[PDB]
Amino acid sequence: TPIATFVSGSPSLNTYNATTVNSSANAFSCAYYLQQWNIQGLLVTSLYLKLDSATMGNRPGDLNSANAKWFTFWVSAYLQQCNPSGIQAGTVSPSTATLTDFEPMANRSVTSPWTYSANGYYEPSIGEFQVFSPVVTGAWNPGNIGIRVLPVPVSASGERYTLLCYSLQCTNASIFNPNNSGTMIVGPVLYSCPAASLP
Amino acid sequence: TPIATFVSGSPSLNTYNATTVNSSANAFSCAYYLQQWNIQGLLVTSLYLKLDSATMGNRPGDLNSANAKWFTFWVSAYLQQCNPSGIQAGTVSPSTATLTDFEPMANRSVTSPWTYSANGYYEPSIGEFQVFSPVVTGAWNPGNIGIRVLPVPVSASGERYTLLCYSLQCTNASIFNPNNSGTMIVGPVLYSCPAASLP
Amino acid sequence: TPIATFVSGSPSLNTYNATTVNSSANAFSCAYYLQQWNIQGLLVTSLYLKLDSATMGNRPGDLNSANAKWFTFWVSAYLQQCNPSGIQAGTVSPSTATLTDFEPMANRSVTSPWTYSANGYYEPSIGEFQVFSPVVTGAWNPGNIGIRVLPVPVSASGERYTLLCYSLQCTNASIFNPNNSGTMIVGPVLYSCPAASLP
């Protein structure tokens, strides 16, 4: 068809099956809801993200860990080969489309790639910047969330993949401090870029 | 079809038949031009807004009223049941589509709803933030317009609707002061989010 | 078809065949990569821009020239009649579409037009503002790039055209100072607005 779609994640944001690594290299479980479109070669991506002190995992309490403000989330079309944030199998429409139809076209501003790890922290300092106010509860007080978002080339086992990288940038240290209970939801974050291929 | 469209409002921005309520709970007539797309479940909305001292209505001159800087505009797909800003009947294409095809999908970050009034002021403090420089004339000097925009759940008579809420945030007090004559146009403001349904 | 596409420019950003004029009225050669969609009357535009001290042309070294921070780039659907930035012939799909299918609908906030020159500097002070961090090399240190982007009406020989205008706004003076060698890439800059016509 001229238009293909992909949907993945937890509509309730109550299943915490993806992964995000913060600037102190600490890995956490998170919830997400991902909706994507490939409209004749234009990739449109909608993303919600949620963290919850009760499900994210252990928060180290050393000063550096507790004061972390940035964390990275990766949307991938390569769920087995290059999937650092653990995007789940979802639903592609129509049946003749395949998830690789949702790869972004290569970023023409960046050609040195990130070497993929399962728990490595990558911090982009280039690209588009958006600003969100999050929905927070409890003692969590990150303030505004800045969002750096771009396609990034990623190398894994001699292959190159372009993924979508989101750097979520809290104004305040708060959510990675183990003394503070609460939750945070951000979205829907919209991002468009050229797709690698036509559907 | 895979794509449906809706167009409503005043192309000239010279018919002032919609309504906006400002932070002092004062209601004003405004002009708008609304163009929307439902592209296989992706809702894309383009909006222009205009205020004119000569057509907006009486501006109370108490300090609180005169110093108001924020005002809220509502795009609705429910023109009879939940239409706080008075969006006008328009044109849906194709003929097999219906305006409810333009409801946004529920915001997954917010589930406590706004109780609809015809003249109630609602102020979102969550969601995406955009920045526009307005087109102004006369003594109107709002400066930059910040725009908080998101889908919001709205309760009316036991039913729930998701609307698009725009909070337009003047840098300076100016346009609600009855001593100042002039006009302001902002747009085109673009906003995308998932639609509730496929066309 | 319901969807038409246009692609033009240098995928490598290594062919410098377009033109940008900066705030000191100095003209430079630049590289670009332009991908556009007309989705049933919605115009979506993706743009990369690159400058390189080695290919941009002579940089005057008077204080005013060297300290220039803003420069304007024009995306046009009128490659012969109104093409101030020198957008190159490209590829329209399908074969039944024509490049004029990519004209933006008129900006409803602005009706006084710019008088086109081949080397005139136009500076918009109205419209949407985005923020990018650029990819830079060498001694180039512009810092963040603010981007004012909007459709603008342009008059040429009694005809009116709407073009897309991008004002790229460096934080620091740097890239127009002839003492500083280096390069800058910004993108992909995405911009949507209503199209003048259906494909």
Distances (CA, A) of B107 to A88, A125, A190, B78, C180: 21, 29, 13, 17, 48
Q: In one letter, which amino acid is C44?
A: V
In contact, C155 and C98? CB cutoff 8 Å: no
Structure-derived torsion over alpha carbons of residues A112, A115, A121, A125, reported in degrees to the nearest 10: 0
Per-residue tokens: A199: 């559907």
Angstrom distance (rounded) from CA A69 to CA C121: 41
The beta strand positions in A17-60, using DSSP E, are: 18-22, 27-39, 42-52
Containing A155, the helix (H) or strand (E) segment is: strand A145-156
Distances (CA, A) of B181 to A19, B173, B184, B185, C4: 54, 13, 10, 14, 44
In contact, A123 and A146? CB cutoff 8 Å: no
Angstrom distance (rounded) from CA A72 to CA A51: 12
3-state secondary structure of B51: strand
Distances (CA, A) of B15 to A84, B8, B49: 53, 12, 11
Angstrom distance (rounded) from CA A84 to CA C83: 44
Per-residue tokens: B67: 């110093």
Per-residue tokens: C131: 């923020």
The beta strand positions in C40-181, using DSSP E, are: 42-52, 70-75, 91-93, 114-115, 127-133, 135-138, 145-156, 159-170
| Sign of the dihedral defined by the CA atoms of residues C107, C110, C111, C116, in that order | negative
Q: In one letter, which amino acid is B106?
A: A
Closest CA to C15 of C3, C32, C28: C32
Task: Report chain B's terminal Cα–Cα distance, integer Å.
Answer: 6
Closest CA to C141 of C185, C189, C182, C187: C182
Angstrom distance (rounded) from CA C39 to CA C139: 41
- C138's torsion region: left (phi>0), alpha (psi -120 to 50) or beta? left
Percent helix / strand / coil, chain B, rounded to 5: 5, 50, 45
Angstrom distance (rounded) from CA A100 to CA A121: 24
Residue of C nearest to A104 (CA): C188
Q: In one letter, which amino acid is B56?
A: M
Percent helix / strand / coil, chain C, rounded to 5: 5, 50, 45
In contact, B37 and C40? CB cutoff 8 Å: yes
Instruction: Tell me which residue in B40, B107, B151 faces A37 most closely, judged by beta carbons.
Output: B40
Distances (CA, A) of B166 to B25, B162, C74: 16, 13, 29
Residue C166: phi and psi, rounded to 5, are: -120, 120
Residue C20 C-alpha from the chain's centroid: 7
The reported resolution of this PDB entry, expressed in Å, is 1.6
Residue B74 C-alpha from the chain's centroid: 4
Per-residue tokens: C180: 């500083």
Angstrom distance (rounded) from CA A51 to CA B195: 24
Biggest CA–CA distance in chain C, Å, is 53
CB burial of residue C97 (10 Å; 0-12, 13-18, 19+): middle
Angstrom distance (rounded) from CA B30 to CA A94: 43
Per-residue tokens: B25: 């709970």
Angstrom distance (rounded) from CA B27 to CA B68: 12
3-state secondary structure of B177: coil
Angstrom distance (rounded) from CA B37 to CA B4: 6
Distances (CA, A) of B24 to B52, B117, B141: 18, 15, 19
Return the residue in B44, B108, B128 with the most chain A beta carbons within 10 A, the one to mutate for interface testing: B108
| Contact state of A108 with C46 under an 8 Å Cβ cutoff | no
| Contact state of B193 with A33 under an 8 Å Cβ cutoff | no
Q: In one letter, which amino acid is C102?
A: F
Percent helix / strand / coil, chain A, rounded to 5: 5, 50, 45
Structure determination method: X-ray
In contact, C68 and C121? CB cutoff 8 Å: no
What are the sequence ranges of the domains in chain A? 1-199
| Sign of the dihedral defined by the CA atoms of residues B199, A41, A197, C92, in that order | positive
3-state secondary structure of B196: coil
Per-residue tokens: C52: 């390189």
Closest CA to B147 of B134, B128, B172: B128
The verdict on B106 touching A (C-beta cutoff 8 Å) is no
CB burial of residue B58 (10 Å; 0-12, 13-18, 19+): exposed
| Contact state of A33 with B108 under an 8 Å Cβ cutoff | yes
Angle at C74 between CA C68 and CA C77, to 5 degrees: 175
Q: In the complex, which subunits touch C with 3 or more CB pairs below 8 angstroms?
A: A, B
Residue B65: phi and psi, rounded to 5, are: -60, -50
C159-170 and B159-170 strand pairing? unpaired
Q: In one letter, which amino acid is A95?
A: S
Closest CA to C34 of C83, C84, C88: C88
In contact, B183 and B136? CB cutoff 8 Å: yes
Structure-derived torsion over alpha carbons of residues C123, C131, C160, B13, reported in degrees to the nearest 10: -110
Residues in B closer than 8 angstroms to A37, CB to CB, are 39-42
- Kindly give, in sequence order, each residue whose CB lies less than 8 Å from that of residue C168, ignoring residues fewer than 6 positions away: C49, C70, C71, C72, C73, C145, C146, C147, C186
Structure-derived torsion over alpha carbons of residues C160, B190, C46, C167, reported in degrees to the nearest 10: 60
Angstrom distance (rounded) from CA A166 to CA A123: 9
Residue A147 C-alpha from the chain's centroid: 10
In contact, C66 and C24? CB cutoff 8 Å: no
Residue of A nearest to C3 (CA): A40
In contact, C178 and C59? CB cutoff 8 Å: yes
Per-residue tokens: A154: 């990623």
Closest CA to B156 of B93, B103, B114: B114
| Contact state of A41 with C37 under an 8 Å Cβ cutoff | yes
The verdict on B169 touching C (C-beta cutoff 8 Å) is no
In contact, A129 and A167? CB cutoff 8 Å: no
The verdict on B29 touching C (C-beta cutoff 8 Å) is no
Instruction: Tell me which residue in B2, B39, B192 faces A190 most closely, judged by beta carbons.
Output: B192
The verdict on A2 touching B (C-beta cutoff 8 Å) is yes
DSSP-assigned beta bridge partners for residue B168: B71, B147
DSSP-assigned beta bridge partners for residue B75: B164
Angstrom distance (rounded) from CA A13 to CA B111: 12
Other CB atoms closer than 10 Å to residue C64's CB: what's the count? 12
| Contact state of B46 with C193 under an 8 Å Cβ cutoff | yes
Angle at B2 between CA A198 and CA B7, to 5 degrees: 115
Angstrom distance (rounded) from CA A94 to CA A100: 13
Angstrom distance (rounded) from CA C162 to CA C151: 6
Per-residue tokens: B34: 């609304």
Other CB atoms closer than 10 Å to residue A119's CB: what's the count? 10
Residue A100 C-alpha from the chain's centroid: 17
In contact, C52 and C175? CB cutoff 8 Å: no
In contact, C28 and C121? CB cutoff 8 Å: no
| Contact state of A192 with C187 under an 8 Å Cβ cutoff | no
Q: Which residue has the tokens 């209970």?
A: A181
3-state secondary structure of A99: helix
DSSP state of A119: S
Closest CA to B84 of B111, B122, B47: B122
The verdict on C97 touching A (C-beta cutoff 8 Å) is no
DSSP state of A167: E
Q: Which residue has the tokens 């990150």?
A: A142
Return the residue in A37, A42, A162 with the most chain C beta carbons within 10 A, the one to mutate for interface testing: A42
Angstrom distance (rounded) from CA C36 to CA C47: 9
In contact, B109 and A185? CB cutoff 8 Å: yes
In contact, A77 and A102? CB cutoff 8 Å: yes
The verdict on C111 touching B (C-beta cutoff 8 Å) is no
Q: Which residue has the tokens 């503002």?
A: C129
Distances (CA, A) of B4 to B41, B48, B75, B94, B197: 10, 20, 17, 6, 11
- Kindly give, in sequence order, each residue whose CB lies less than 8 Å from that of residue B72, ignoring residues fewer than 6 positions away: B20, B21, B22, B121, B122, B123, B124, B165, B166, B167, B168
Closest CA–CA distance from residue A181 to any residue of chain B (Å): 18
Side-chain-facing half-sphere of B114: CA atoms under 13 Å: 24
Helix extents (H) in C13-143: 63-66
DSSP state of B14: -
Closest CA to B51 of B185, B187, B189, B188: B185
Angstrom distance (rounded) from CA B129 to CA B117: 25
The verdict on C128 touching B (C-beta cutoff 8 Å) is yes
The verdict on B2 touching A (C-beta cutoff 8 Å) is yes
Q: In the complex, which subunits touch B with 3 or more CB pairs below 8 angstroms?
A: A, C
Residue B148 C-alpha from the chain's centroid: 11
Per-residue tokens: B112: 């406590």
